[PDB]
């Protein structure tokens, strides 16, 4: 706070969700548009991360992390690609239909934006969707990104120079 250095480099622009409604078992697929006012030293770091109900663990479970090389000043585009989540680590008894996902960029280290996006499974047969198992068939959920109803989330941190030690 008694340091603002507010001035944003990056700034999100917009997140194609192509490949959306994949099956829970595909990759994430997005379309990220950003621009850069000034050049950068370091590198973006994207990452997403699933978050759900529970009854010990299945939030927080980061799906994946990348780092981008140089930021060319502008109007960029990077596709982002995000393993999906390992079926070891969801509800065994689920049937969690509404779970979220945290797309957020970082930079040295330091968060500056967060994509929130509630997401929408069902098993994929007609009966199976009148009459559940007691077994999460993983390979039977079709996953449904609301990417329609995105929360945006900007907070402020330093970027390159402020001249470390004055």
Same mark, same amino acid.
């Given at each position: 706070?008694?340091?603002? =250095? $507010?001035?944003?480099?990056?700034? *999100?622009? $917009?997140?194609?969700? *192509? @490949? @959306?409604?994949?099956?829970?078992? %595909?990759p994430y697929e997005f379309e990220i548009t950003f621009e850069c006012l000034e050049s !950068? ?10 978050? $759900?109900? &529970?009854?010990?663990? %299945?939030? %927080? ?5 990348? *780092? ?5 000043? $502008?109007? /960029?585009?990077?596709?982002? &690609?995000? %393993?999906?989540? =390992? ?7 689920? !049937?969690? =239909?509404?779970?979220?996902?945290? *797309?957020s960029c970082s930079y040295d280290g330091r968060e500056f934006v967060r994509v929130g996006?509630?997401?929408? /499974? +069902?098993?994929? +047969?007609? +009966?199976?969707? +009148? ?12 996953? /449904?990104? !609301? ?8 907070? @402020?941190?330093?970027?390159? @120079? ?5």
């Amino acid at each position: 706070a008694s340091g603002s =250095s $507010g001035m944003s480099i990056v700034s *999100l622009l $917009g997140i194609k969700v *192509l @490949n @959306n409604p994949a099956k829970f078992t %595909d990759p994430y697929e997005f379309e990220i548009t950003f621009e850069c006012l000034e050049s !950068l030293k370091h590198d973006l770091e994207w990452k997403l991360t699933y978050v $759900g109900s &529970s009854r010990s663990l %299945d939030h %927080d479970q980061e799906l994946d992390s990348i *780092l981008v090389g140089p930021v060319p000043v $502008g109007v /960029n585009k990077f596709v982002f &690609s995000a %393993d999906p989540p =390992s079926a070891e680590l969801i509800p065994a008894s689920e !049937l969690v =239909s509404v779970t979220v996902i945290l *797309l957020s960029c970082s930079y040295d280290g330091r968060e500056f934006v967060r994509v929130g996006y509630y997401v929408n /499974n +069902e098993y994929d +047969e007609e +009966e199976l969707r +009148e009459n559940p198992p007691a077994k999460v068939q993983v390979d039977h959920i079709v996953r /449904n990104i !609301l990417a329609e109803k995105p929360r945006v989330t900007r907070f @402020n941190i330093v970027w390159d @120079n402020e001249n470390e030690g004055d």
